[PDB]
């Protein structure tokens, strides 16, 4: 419910980026697991480990180091830090000034 | 399912429907004010799964919680004016009601 997938009007859902980021991390995590089951040549599993690391690193703090992954809107999608940190995180607006 | 615009809406007396015509949409020229219904629209509620003692109060007075709840277009509060025109855009698949 903190990262919902609310149904807007017209069968056009609205979600927060965190679902996209969690998809991106779970996909590469599962793919790494299957690579480790297949006993792949360590070149591909190395690339998979690095991909999973970038996924987790963009889930934790997107835009921190590696040119943040952009969502489907062209846009650098938010991560847990951006829901916390900055002018727009929790600590600033809804944590100080509310309706 | 669909949503209707019929002039029969649950949980409102006939006194609040002297404005709506049979087809559900207000008469052109009627003087409405806040809280009146400009359009009578209901959406299906399935299903309620009601409470304790509310169940007893239902049994006592033999009523039935309606399968529908109403989401009808009422004048925003404060407004007070004359309905001067009403258009009815209908999707192509649907069939026009009486007012359209």
């Amino acid at each position: 419910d903190l990262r919902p997938l609310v149904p807007l009007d017209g069968g056009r859902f609205a979600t927060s980026d965190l679902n996209d980021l969690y998809r991106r991390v779970i996909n590469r995590n599962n793919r790494l697991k299957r690579l480790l089951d297949l006993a792949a040549p360590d070149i591909i599993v190395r690339n998979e480990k690095r991909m999973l690391q970038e996924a987790v690193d963009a889930l934790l703090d997107n835009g921190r180091r590696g040119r943040a992954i952009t969502g489907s809107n062209k846009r650098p999608l938010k991560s847990l830090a951006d829901m916390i940190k900055g002018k727009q995180g929790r600590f600033r607006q809804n944590l100080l000034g509310k309706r | 399912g669909p949503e209707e615009i019929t002039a029969d809406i649950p949980n409102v007396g006939e006194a609040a429907l002297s404005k709506l015509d049979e087809s559900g949409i207000v008469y052109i020229g009627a003087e409405v004010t806040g809280g009146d219904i400009l359009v009578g629209k209901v959406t299906p509620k399935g299903e309620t799964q009601l409470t304790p003692e509310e169940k007893l109060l239902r049994a006592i007075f033999g009523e039935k919680a309606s399968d529908v709840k109403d989401s009808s277009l009422r004048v925003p509060n404060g407004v007070s004016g004359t309905v001067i025109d009403v258009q009815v855009f209908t999707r192509d698949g649907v069939e026009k009601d009486k007012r359209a």
Partner: protein
């Protein structure tokens, strides 16, 4: 290090432009992303690199302070390197570029390598009596129709010919097996004839991994003799190589290990129990698997050798083809899956290909592997491209829709009405509306409507499940009113009313449980409930109650 005095310049000015941070850069930076990262590192410690003259009259220092020297260290180091260690894609491109893309008919060579690598394991299988006994048991098992006869083979090297060459296997196996110095030639020739077969995949897989399980039980008892004595009893490693290694079944290497009367030997009395019992284990296990230990030991050892040879060449095969894989994947790039997802799914398909190859078909490996890889890549793009997983045939329908829509847009003048697509396609015209409302992607709840506050979309979504505080404060009043009404009733009728619904208790009860509570039939209870209801229906107990029915 002009960078280092660039930092001091940006400080002693209190700000840096893009002009200065383009002047005092390294002259050898070609990858712009390095410029990105370093200007970020600069701003992280101060000072912020705006693009012009300002900060002229803006005298506002959040850049303190431990970050300053660390970031200066990182900047002074960025010249010591050249990058990049920040793009996985480019590091993978380099990684595959390491392997020379020259396997020009060396493929067939390494493929024959794979073939005669996975047949040393074939022989080590052929020397494993337990797997071959399983094959015999399942011959007599499937020919008795305990499974489909194809449960043994994915093709072979005739039903009655199959079963009767299995019969000759049975006869050669008995002459192999009851001839306990006669077993040598019989078993070896039967393995020669046996190596002309072609198992079911799962059959061979299970039988060989249970071969591994057998040798690993032997290996576990080896542990039980090793760490219990050499590493725990402080048995001499040279001793463990001397006495135990070589005999392994007799009692002359451990029971003649305490008995060797040494500082090491007569300390074996405390871990003597589990070695005593492990000898029993291994001595019965010799017959349990069907042969004394060392034989099947080194047969599965050569098995390991052969499998290692097989795998180590499939590596070179896979890399030489992934050089192609990247290229083949590049034509699926915008389809919803970022690039390195595509090439990783491709490489999974590529391993699939290399483990299903044949030089016998005389063609070029490229076409076979590229079929595999395009199939698996489009499988990926289908199965993990959207936030709501829509099936693949549905994606086919959507693609048809997009193509025919673009076509009607430029053939039928203005645009395609879905009533018109209902004819242009052979679909039922609500399938079309459905598939159109199903193919759309979700709006991001943080997409900002460009208003004053810069509030996004996810802050204008009411919560249509909560109950309005007026409604909860009503039914609390309803609990009050109903309890009041019941209070003015006989205890029989009141308890029956409560127990009948769930009023201010746990679960409501059927009439029979109620009669249980009062020792009555359910008809008595229905009478009580009906009388209480009739009593309550009248006003003076029902005015406020019926007013709760606001209508």
């Amino acid at each position: 290090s002009q960078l280092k005095l660039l930092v001091t310049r940006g400080k002693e000015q209190g700000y840096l432009t893009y002009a200065e941070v383009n002047d005092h850069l390294p002259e050898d930076i070609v990858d712009s992303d390095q410029i990105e990262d370093i200007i970020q590192m600069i701003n992280d410690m101060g000072i912020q690199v705006m693009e012009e003259a300002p900060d002229a009259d803006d005298l506002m220092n959040t850049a303190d302070e431990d970050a300053a020297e660390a970031a200066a260290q990182v900047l002074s180091s960025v010249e010591s390197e050249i990058g990049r260690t920040t793009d996985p894609v480019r590091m993978y491109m380099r990684e595959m570029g390491t392997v020379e893309l020259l396997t020009r008919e060396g493929e067939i060579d390494i493929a024959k390598r794979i073939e005669d690598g996975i047949n040393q394991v074939q022989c080590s299988v052929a020397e494993y009596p337990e797997a071959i006994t399983y094959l015999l048991e399942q011959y007599d098992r499937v020919e008795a129709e305990e499974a489909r006869l194809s449960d043994l083979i994915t093709g072979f090297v005739d039903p009655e010919l199959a079963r009767e060459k299995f019969a000759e296997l049975r006869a050669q196996y008995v002459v192999t097996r009851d001839t306990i110095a006669t077993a040598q030639e019989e078993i070896l020739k039967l393995s020669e004839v046996f190596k002309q077969f072609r198992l079911v995949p799962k059959q061979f897989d299970y039988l060989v991994n249970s071969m591994r399980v057998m040798m690993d039980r032997v290996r576990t008892q080896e542990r039980l003799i090793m760490k219990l004595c050499v590493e725990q009893c402080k048995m001499p490693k040279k001793n463990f190589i001397t006495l135990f290694t070589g005999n392994e079944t007799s009692d002359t290497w451990f029971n003649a290990a305490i008995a060797m009367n040494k500082p090491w030997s007569e300390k074996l009395h405390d871990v003597s129990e589990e070695v005593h019992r492990a000898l029993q284990k291994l001595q019965q296990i010799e017959e349990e698997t069907g042969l004394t230990i060392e034989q099947v030991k080194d047969i599965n050892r050569r098995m390991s050798i052969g499998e290692a040879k097989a795998r180590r060449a499939k590596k070179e095969m896979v890399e030489a083809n992934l050089r192609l894989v990247i290229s083949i994947a590049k034509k699926y790039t915008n389809r919803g899956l970022q690039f390195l997802d595509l090439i990783q799914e491709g490489n999974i398909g590529l391993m699939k290909a290399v483990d299903k190859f044949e030089y016998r078909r005389g063609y070029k490996f490229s076409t076979y592997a590229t079929w595999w890889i395009r199939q698996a890549i489009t499988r990926s793009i289908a199965d993990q491209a959207r936030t709501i997983r829509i099936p693949v045939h549905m994606i086919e329908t959507i693609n048809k829709l997009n193509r025919i829509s673009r076509q009607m847009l430029q053939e039928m003048g203005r645009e395609p009405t879905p009533e018109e697509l209902a004819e242009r396609m052979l679909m039922p015209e609500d399938k079309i509306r459905k598939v159109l409302k199903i193919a759309k992607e979700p709006i991001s709840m943080e997409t900002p409507i460009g208003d004053d506050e810069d509030s996004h979309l996810g802050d204008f979504i009411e919560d249509t499940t909560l109950e309005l505080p007026l409604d909860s404060a009503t039914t609390e009043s309803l609990r009050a009113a109903t309890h009041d009404v019941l209070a003015g009733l006989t205890a029989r009728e009141a308890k029956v009313l409560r127990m009948r619904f769930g009023i201010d208790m746990n679960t409501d009860y059927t009439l029979e449980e109620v009669g249980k509570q009062f020792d009555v039939t359910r008809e008595r209870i229905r009478q009580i409930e009906a009388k209480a209801l009739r009593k309550l229906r009248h006003p003076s107990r029902s005015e406020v109650l019926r007013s709760f029915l606001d209508d």
